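Q: What does the assembly look like in three dimensions?
Context provided by user:
Components: four
Sequences:
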Amino acid sequence: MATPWSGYLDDVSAKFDTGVDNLQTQVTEALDKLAAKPSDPALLAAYQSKLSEYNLYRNAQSNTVKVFKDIDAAIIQNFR
Amino acid sequence: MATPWSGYLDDVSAKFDTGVDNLQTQVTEALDKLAAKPSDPALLAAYQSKLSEYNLYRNAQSNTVKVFKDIDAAIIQNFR
Amino acid sequence: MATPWSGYLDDVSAKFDTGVDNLQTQVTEALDKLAAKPSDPALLAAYQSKLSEYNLYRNAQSNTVKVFKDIDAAIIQNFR
Amino acid sequence: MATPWSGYLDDVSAKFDTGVDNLQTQVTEALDKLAAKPSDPALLAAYQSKLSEYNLYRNAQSNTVKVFKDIDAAIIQNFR
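A: Here is the predicted structure of the complete assembly.
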């Protein structure tokens, strides 16, 4: 049997991965559609919201690892 | 079973879609009608009202994502 | 193979062009006919109606590019 | 064999390029036509719309590269 990787920081990353799982394909689909369409009321606005959603996936993930590693580093320094 | 995308910002966007669902086809139908018509006072007033209806929908999406993102950005940046 | 220019704003402009394609030649034909005539009730009413049709083509095109660019500018500004 | 440059930010730039590939020559053609004419309502509306399209290419490109670099900079700062 395979043993799943148990981690607090890894779980948070996987939580966002499952949420925007199909969102990744939606971003690339809207990006290619806009490529051959200069000005688009629909495509540009749709991509606007979907791009910011991707923006949060990368920002929120980097924020959780930032806070966790900082406080965790202080604990590791105590062990001496 | 498939799980739907649960989001506050996504709900507002999809909420406007249900309202202008058949409205999108009405814009293209009136566009082709005017394209092959020299001058009509009736179709001019019809397209005029339908044009802004689309304008308000698209501007509402960029509006909700703008005000919600600004306040949410301050919250996520607080997490440090 | 040649790739056609795909654009929503350009489609609206070309839409009116297919409608008043032979209309442009009709305006110049009636203009020269009016210039060689002192006063005629028939050509006056004919040119009057055809003049407004040309006015609708130039106005409808400038109207669509104006309302569309305004709303699309809001979206573009969000990208930051 | 040659290896193509794989980049997300570069892909977005080239994405807009494939669309307005022949538009660059269309802008210069309309520019020379405008300089060789005193005043034309037809070319004024044409160049106006085409100038908006060139603004689309330079804006969306600079817009996407700006938001992507910001969140990407946060990740790089995390690696320490």
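Follow-up: Residues 1-80 of chain B form one domain.
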